[PDB]
Amino acid sequence: RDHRKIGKQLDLYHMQEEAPGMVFWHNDGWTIFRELEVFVRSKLKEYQYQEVKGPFMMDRVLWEKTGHWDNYKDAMFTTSSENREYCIKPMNCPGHVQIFNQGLKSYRDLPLRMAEFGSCHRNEPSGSLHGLMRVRGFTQDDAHIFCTEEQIRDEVNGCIRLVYDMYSTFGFEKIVVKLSTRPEKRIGSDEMWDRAEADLAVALEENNIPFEYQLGEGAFYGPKIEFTLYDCLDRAWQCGTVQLDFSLPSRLSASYVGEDNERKVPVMIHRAILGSMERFIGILTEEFAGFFPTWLAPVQVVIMNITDSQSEYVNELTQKLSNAGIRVKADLRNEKIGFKIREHTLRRVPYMLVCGDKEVESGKVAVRTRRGKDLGSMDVNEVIEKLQQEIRSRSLKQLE
Amino acid sequence: RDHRKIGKQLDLYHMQEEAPGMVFWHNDGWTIFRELEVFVRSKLKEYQYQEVKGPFMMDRVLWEKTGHWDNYKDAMFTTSSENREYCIKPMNCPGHVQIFNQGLKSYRDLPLRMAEFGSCHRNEPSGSLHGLMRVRGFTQDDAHIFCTEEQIRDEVNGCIRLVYDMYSTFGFEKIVVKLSTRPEKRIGSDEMWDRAEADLAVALEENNIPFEYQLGEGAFYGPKIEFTLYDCLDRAWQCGTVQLDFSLPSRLSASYVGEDNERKVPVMIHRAILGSMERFIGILTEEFAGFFPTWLAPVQVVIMNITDSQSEYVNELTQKLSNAGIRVKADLRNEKIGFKIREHTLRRVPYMLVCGDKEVESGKVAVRTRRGKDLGSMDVNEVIEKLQQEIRSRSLKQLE
Ligand SMILES: *C(=O)[C@@H](NC(=O)c1cccc(O)c1O)[C@H](O)Cc1ccc([N+](=O)[O-])cc1
Ligand SMILES: *C(=O)[C@@H](NC(=O)c1cccc(O)c1O)[C@H](O)Cc1ccc([N+](=O)[O-])cc1
Ligand SMILES: [Zn+2]
Ligand SMILES: [Zn+2]
C-alpha cells in the first residue's frame, strides 16, 4: 500500500533527479488523471462554473500588487526576459481576477464562478519532496467565486455540497471539518471578521455538518473551512478548502456596479475539493492499493482466446467494446490462459473476458473479475451494457 | 476578419503587458480549445497513440545532453532552485525520451507512438509577438513515434493520413507539401540520408501527394515534410511537420533489444498536425470570421420566451437540451424578441429557439439559424436528434 511502488509496478508515472518533484505521467497514470478531469468537469457543469485557463507566468510587478510576493517569494520560481522579472504561477487566483477585470461587470453578473485545472509550481525544499504528495509541480482543481456579501452564505453552501458529493464518489465518508478563525495580524474590522466567520459557521449548520475551530489559524484576509478525509487506514488527509478573501479583489482593482448603481468590490471565495490532483491520485492509489474502480482503471477489459481458432472473434469483440467507449485490449499471445490471466490480474484489470468456441458460436463471453469470481457466459450486448452502466455511474463496486 | 478583433468581441481570450505573448483563455475561448482537444483525442484513439504528460521544466544539464542548449539557449526561459539551473521546456521531445527510457524496451514494443498536449515556452523577442499567432507560451498537438528503420515508411504513411483527415474536418482542402532535404552541416552518412529522404518521398508517393523539395533546409539530424494549408482568403499557413531524427535518441541513451537480440537505437519521428493550437484557433477564427461550426461554437443554442407565460417551458427545454450534451443557455430577460435575437446573432450563436403559447402547448420549438433562415416549429426530440447528429459529425454546414 505505497503509491510510489504501485506507481512503478503499474507503470503510472515516474520521477527523476533532472526534474525534482515533477511528475512524468506515463500513459496509464495520465489516463487516471484525465478521468479525474472528466469527473470534475461533470461537476463544473452541474454546479454551473465557467472553466478558464490563465498563463503560466506573469510579471513580478503584478505579484507584488497581490501582496503575495512579500510573504511567499521564496516558494516562487522566477525567470527573465528583456530585463523584466516573471514568476511562474504558484496559484491561479490573480489570473482569475485578471480575467474578471476585462469588461465592466454588474451585480447582474454575480455570483460568477470561475474554475481552472491550473498548473502551479512552488520552489519546495528538495528534502521535503515525497512521491506524488509533496511536489514542486502540481495541478489544482481550482475555482474562484466572485459575489456580493449577501451571496456568500449561499455560495459556501454550494461548495459544501460539492465537497461531500465528490468525496462520497470515492468511498470517503469519514470527513472532519475545521473552521479557522481570525489570526493575530489581519485586515478588516472586527465586525467584518465577526460576520465572515458567522457565514462559514451558518453554511455548515444549514448543511448539518458538525465542525470545530482552529483558533487563530486563519489567513490574514479571511477565515476558511478545511475538509479532512479519512482513508480506509484511518490516516487523515486535508484536501478541501473554502477560503474567503476580502483583500485580493481590492488589491487588483476588481469592481462591479451594484443594485444602487454605486461601485463595489466583490467578495472572492477560493475553493478546491481534491486539492492537488497528483496528491489525490496518490491517496487513491493507496486507498485502493492499485485496484481502481472500473471507471478509473487504466485498462478496463482484456479479451483473450483459448486457441488461434478465436483470434478474430476476440478482435471483433475488442472493436465492439471499444466503440462502446470501453478501454479494452486483446491478448492473443501464444501463452497458457492461466499465464495471461495472472499477467492482467497483476495489472489490476477489472474484467477478464475469455472466449472459447463454446462461446464463439453462441455469441457470448465468459467473464472473470480481477478478484477471481467467475460470472460465466453472458450475451455480449448484455455485458457491454452492464459495463457502461458501471462506468457511467462511477461505481466503486464491480458486478456482485 | 481579424482574430484579435473577433477575440475581444466574442470574449474568447485576452492578453496584457504583464505577460506578453501569453494568452488568458476566457470561458468561451477555452470551450473552443477544449473541443479541439477532444477532436485530437478522438484521432489519437483511432491511430493508436499513447497520451502522456511530461514535466514543465527540466535540469539544464539534460538540455545540454540534447545539443539544443548550444543552438537555442537564447530562446529558453531559465530558472534557479538550490543552485541548479532549469529550463522551462520549449519542446516535448526530450521529456518523451525520458518516458521511453523507463523499462527495457524490446522490438516487440515498437512502433511506440506517444502524444502530448505539451505546454512549451519560448523567449520570442517581444517586437515579433502578434495575437494568437506568434506568442511566448503555446500548446502543441505533439507526438513522437519510436520505431525501427524498417518501420519508418508505414509510420510516416500513418502521419500523412492523419494530416489530411484533420485538415479536411475544418474545410481546408488546398494543401501544399514540401520535403526538406539534407543541410550543409549534418549528422549521419550520405547513405543514411539517401534512405531517409527516400522514405519520406515514398510515403507521400503511396498516398498520391504531389510535392516539392526545399533544398538544404533540413535539420542537421534528419529530413522533414512540411504541410501548408490555404484558407478561404487563399493565405498560406504552415502547420504540419514530420521530422525524422537520427541523433536525439542516441544522445539520450534510448535503446531496444532487437529481434537479433542485439541492442539498437530507435528512430524518432517528430510529428505535429495543427502545430500551435493557439495559432490554429487564430486561423480558424479568421477562416470562419467568428461563425464557428456548431461543434466549435462556444454556445450552440439559445432558447427564448415571447412573454413570461413560457419562462418555465423554456427552462425545462433548456435542461432537456443540456442533458443531451448541447451547450445551451436560456434568455428569459424582459426584452423584445428582435433585441434578444440580435444580441445572440452578434455573438454568432448557431441556433436560436423561440417559444410562445403556440409551441408550448404543442411540444415544439420555432427554430432560427444565425444566417437568418426560419426552419419553423419542429418537434423537440427531432431537433435534439438533428443537433446531436450535426455536432457528432463535426459538420461545417448547418440545417439545410
Ligand atoms: C489565500 O487565499 C490562500 N489560498 C488558498 O488556500 C486556496 C485554496 C484553494 C483554492 C485556492 O484558489 C486558494 O487560493 C493562499 O493562497 C495560501 C497560499 C499558501 C502558500 C502559497 N505558496 O506559494 O507556497 C501560496 C498560497
Ligand atoms: C527538430 O527536432 C525540430 N523539431 C520539430 O520541428 C518538431 C515539429 C513538430 C513536432 C515536434 O515534436 C517537433 O520536435 C526542432 O525541435 C526545431 C526547434 C527546436 C526548438 C526551437 N526553439 O525556439 O527553442 C526551435 C526549433
Ligand atoms: Zn485562490
Ligand atoms: Zn519533437
Residue numbers in the entry:
A (entry chain A), B (entry chain B): 242 to 641
What's in the article?
Aminoacyl-tRNA synthetases (AARSs), a family of essential protein synthesis enzymes, are attractive targets for drug development. Here we present five unusual crystal structures showing that threonyl-tRNA synthetase (ThrRS) is covalently inhibited by a natural product, obafluorin (OB). OB contains a β-lactone ring with a 2,3-dihydroxybenzamidyl moiety attached to the α position and a 4-nitrobenzyl moiety attached to the β position. When ThrRS catalyzes tRNA aminoacylation, the Zn2+ ion recognizes and binds l-threonine, assisting in the l-threonine activation reaction.
To elucidate the mechanism by which OB inhibits ThrRS, we cocrystallized a fragment of Escherichia coli ThrRS containing catalytic and anticodon-binding domains (residues 242–642) with OB and determined the structure to a resolution of 2.5 Å. In the two catalytic domains of ThrRS homodimer, OB was bound to the active site for Thr-AMP formation. In total, 18 residues in the active center of ThrRS were located within 4.5 Å of OB and thus interacted with it. Interestingly, the four-membered ring of the β-lactone of OB was opened in the ThrRS-OB structure. Instead, the acyl group formed a new ester bond with the phenolic group of Tyr462. In addition, the two hydroxyl groups on the o-diphenol moiety of OB formed two coordination bonds with the conserved catalytic Zn2+ ion of ThrRS. This structure suggests that OB inhibits ThrRS by forming coordination bonds with the Zn2+ ion in the catalytic center of ThrRS, allowing its β-lactone ring to be approached and attacked by the phenolic group of Tyr462, and finally forming a new covalent bond with Tyr462. The ThrRS-OB structure showed that the o-diphenol group of OB occupied the position of l-threonine and replaced it to bind Zn2+ ion and Asp383. At the same time, the conformations of Gln484 and Met332 were changed to accommodate OB. Therefore, the nitrobenzene group of OB occupied the binding site of tRNA A76, which prevented tRNA from entering the active center of ThrRS.
